[PDB]
Design a protein around this ligand. Sequence first.
Ligand SMILES: NC(=O)c1ccc[n+]([C@@H]2O[C@H](COP(=O)([O-])OP(=O)(O)OC[C@H]3O[C@@H](n4cnc5c(N)ncnc54)[C@H](O)[C@@H]3O)[C@@H](O)[C@H]2O)c1
Ligand SMILES: NC(=O)c1ccc[n+]([C@@H]2O[C@H](COP(=O)([O-])OP(=O)(O)OC[C@H]3O[C@@H](n4cnc5c(N)ncnc54)[C@H](O)[C@@H]3O)[C@@H](O)[C@H]2O)c1
Ligand SMILES: O=c1ccn([C@@H]2O[C@H](COP(=O)(O)OP(=O)(O)Oc3ccccc3)[C@@H](O)[C@H]2O)c(=O)[nH]1
Ligand SMILES: O=c1ccn([C@@H]2O[C@H](COP(=O)(O)OP(=O)(O)Oc3ccccc3)[C@@H](O)[C@H]2O)c(=O)[nH]1
Ligand code: NA
Lengths: 338, 338
Amino acid sequence: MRVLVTGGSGYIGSHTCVQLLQNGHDVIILDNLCNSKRSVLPVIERLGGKHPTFVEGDIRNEALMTEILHDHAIDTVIHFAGLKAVGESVQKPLEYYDNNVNGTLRLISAMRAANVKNFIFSSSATVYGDQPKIPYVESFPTGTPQSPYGKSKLMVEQILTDLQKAQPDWSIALLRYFNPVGAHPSGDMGEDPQGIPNNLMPYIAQVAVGRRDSLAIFGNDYPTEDGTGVRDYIHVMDLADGHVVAMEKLANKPGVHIYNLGAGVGNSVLDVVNAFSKACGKPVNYHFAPRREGDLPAYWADASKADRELNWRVTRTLDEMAQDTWHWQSRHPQGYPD
Amino acid sequence: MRVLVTGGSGYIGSHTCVQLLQNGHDVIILDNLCNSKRSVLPVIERLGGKHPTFVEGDIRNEALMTEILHDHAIDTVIHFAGLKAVGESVQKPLEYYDNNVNGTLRLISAMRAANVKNFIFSSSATVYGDQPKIPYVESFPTGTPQSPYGKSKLMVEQILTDLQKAQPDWSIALLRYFNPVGAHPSGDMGEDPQGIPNNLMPYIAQVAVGRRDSLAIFGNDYPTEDGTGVRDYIHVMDLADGHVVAMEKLANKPGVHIYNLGAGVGNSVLDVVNAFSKACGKPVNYHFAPRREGDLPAYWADASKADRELNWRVTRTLDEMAQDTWHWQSRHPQGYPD
Ligand SMILES: NC(=O)c1ccc[n+]([C@@H]2O[C@H](COP(=O)([O-])OP(=O)(O)OC[C@H]3O[C@@H](n4cnc5c(N)ncnc54)[C@H](O)[C@@H]3O)[C@@H](O)[C@H]2O)c1
Ligand SMILES: NC(=O)c1ccc[n+]([C@@H]2O[C@H](COP(=O)([O-])OP(=O)(O)OC[C@H]3O[C@@H](n4cnc5c(N)ncnc54)[C@H](O)[C@@H]3O)[C@@H](O)[C@H]2O)c1
Ligand SMILES: O=c1ccn([C@@H]2O[C@H](COP(=O)(O)OP(=O)(O)Oc3ccccc3)[C@@H](O)[C@H]2O)c(=O)[nH]1
Ligand SMILES: O=c1ccn([C@@H]2O[C@H](COP(=O)(O)OP(=O)(O)Oc3ccccc3)[C@@H](O)[C@H]2O)c(=O)[nH]1
Ligand code: NA
């Protein structure tokens, strides 16, 4: 298939492009590079084993989007592109709604113009809001996301849903991600955050290669076994695989297909830290800081639907997630080159 | 004040401009004329006693919005522009989200660029979703709107809300409308829907003016006192007034100011029918029809907040609404001229 991967030079996108290419698909990457670097391109190619076309551009450029869809004869669209920092979303809501809400709106509008009707969306567990029932099941009604980030994702879901009603020929996948972590086993591709890493894994990794003093653990008095936050961490390679499968399996299958993509188990921040210390042969530095605004105590995925339906499930352990992260971080302390 | 009134040539906005001009404000109307006619302009100026500045254009055009706010030195915006046909919204969700959600996004983004910080949004009682508690109070949690129309409204509410949090110097009024009806007492201004009218009042008036054979009342079964749908009807003139007060009072007062604008009392379809017949002098031809999809059985506003805080309440009566509508319909049976 002729797939257009927006946000393809980004963390999840690049890994996904690798698996796609490995599967023989024709990959066209569309990325504005606001959170990624061109230098990942040759890596995706080398590892993908096949050349993916690259187009520097914005999902908000409807005309450009239409042009690509047509010119490249696209069959399906995997939409990873967007803004994804929770904290920042609070500080700059408009940028979030623009990129996320309007950015997706523009792309699908272009898809309509180009007559493309297969779509895969980068969703999120935030859509569930403050859900007391855990783990999260796709059948649960969506809650109220706390941040603009979270809201923007739910908003997009709703829109895609309405669109699919109005255009019943469309196959739309709403893929709800949990906590993607880890890196290509090659140690040559991985997450490459700019500035102070917001996320857990990346934060630890920089601590360990010495980019940071100490891991600040947000809150220690949660209603959890160790008091720290609990999450469903998933290896980015597993996530990547789930996309190829979803794309291959759902194309041309009308409907809104919702799936939690997670391991279906919780791990605390400390367990994460222990794994890391274990992967890197030296204890990681952390101190306890206050709870982070909007952090939930604990949740994880019920991913049985995908298993049943896509025959997909995770295969990498937390350990590999950590080993693999350390491998990338150590080979490339400052990430990708300019 | 120097006021940008988007959708200013439309029904509500037109009436609002007249009132604003009557208070001596400087008004700039921005309207893409997708549901209005230029011919309304001169009436506005005539009835308002002052010339309004008009600009033909689209709220989605951010550069234009910016240029307008800037060159015009606008200090407050009243945002009526958008699409509002419920049924069509279901068939054409994207256009809805684009004009309403993105249209508003573009508009506020322009405001930030031009440093304008006063806004009034035309909200709707639809945000309440399916609320069994009647009448509706501003403190009630929002619900799940059933159409792309209602959803877009709610989405705009939350976006504006997040924006205010991030830019706490903004004064944002979310004015929730119920069922606007009536017309300028001059009978020279009033609603002028194109094609087959979606709303009750225009239909009745068209029946009454011989433009339609018989009014269909949707559902006789309703758990109401007459089995017909119950609603909060508000005279457009009271509504315009409410906008003027809100604009005047909320200017430069930081916060998200949410208010139901309504009469605070319910009236059935048949109630309204009877009001018109007595207004028009002939019994209004009608019949029963099955329920219209999405219709709620009965709802009305709790408007005490606005009475309390803004010292505003409705002064016009139901008969006045019908009488005035009739007077405009009778005077301008074909609406505004081409
Ligand atoms: N639990 C969650 O909420 C969950 C968790 C992690 C990631 N995700 C989502 O997965 C997707 C990809 O995540 P990631 O970790 O790879 O992030 P990332 O930042 O590494 O990937 C996003 C890519 O999108 C690009 N981009 C952003 N705005 C764009 C625009 N307007 N036009 C073009 N390209 C643009 C960035 O340059 C980057 O290369 C995002 O939608 C993110 O929200 C969801
Ligand atoms: N119960 C409800 O939810 C409720 C009820 C009535 C009105 N309202 C809202 O009040 C507002 C005014 O309603 P109205 O009855 O006067 O409708 P209207 O159609 O008469 O006015 C809207 C005006 O905006 C203009 N317009 C629409 N899209 C535009 C765009 N993208 N750019 C520029 N101009 C554009 C149209 O030409 C029209 O003149 C709307 O936002 C409507 O949704 C809400
Ligand atoms: O420096 C950090 C960052 C995170 N955490 C904790 O680790 C867990 C995971 O947090 P996260 O920020 O890495 O991810 P998330 O759980 O908020 O989920 C995401 C992931 C990507 C985008 C949006 C939400 C949480 O309990 C968090 O409080 C820390 O203790 N220290
Ligand atoms: O030809 C008509 C029009 C409406 N109705 C009924 O009249 C009432 C009012 O309906 P409406 O369409 O005039 O307004 P609404 O109550 O749905 O509210 C609106 C108004 C504008 C935007 C969105 C919702 C309802 O009980 C509706 O079923 C009829 O019986 N016949
Ligand atoms: Na802030």
